[PDB]
Amino acid sequence: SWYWGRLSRQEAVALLQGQRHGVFLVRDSSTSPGDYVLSVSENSRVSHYIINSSGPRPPVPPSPAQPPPGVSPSRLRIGDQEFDSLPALLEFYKIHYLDTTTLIEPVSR
């Protein structure tokens, strides 16, 4: 419901445009491969925060106790905090005061 894949920027805005506060949804960034974005219809303005997400479905495992080469977990990350996945992320934005007021429900129903 909240997980919108392949959602064009122009589309998101066109959907949130004129949408009461509380409406939010995730979408793949255009100039950011394998990166999610938090959409939120503010007071006459739809904001979009950049989020990072793992590429493939499989979660990449860690290396031996020895020095790890190019160590880069696939966990979720956003701002000065990380998360297990999008679900947890969206919840954060709804529980935090990122944009105007807190989120209510996803564009869907």
């Binding site: 904001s47 979009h48 950049i50 956003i78 701002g79 000065d80 990122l98």
Partner: peptide, 13 residues
């Protein structure tokens, strides 16, 4: 220049 997105940080100088 480096303003591709918002990026929730709230720090600045």
């Amino acid at each position: 220049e480096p303003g591709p997105y918002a990026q929730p940080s709230v720090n600045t100088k």
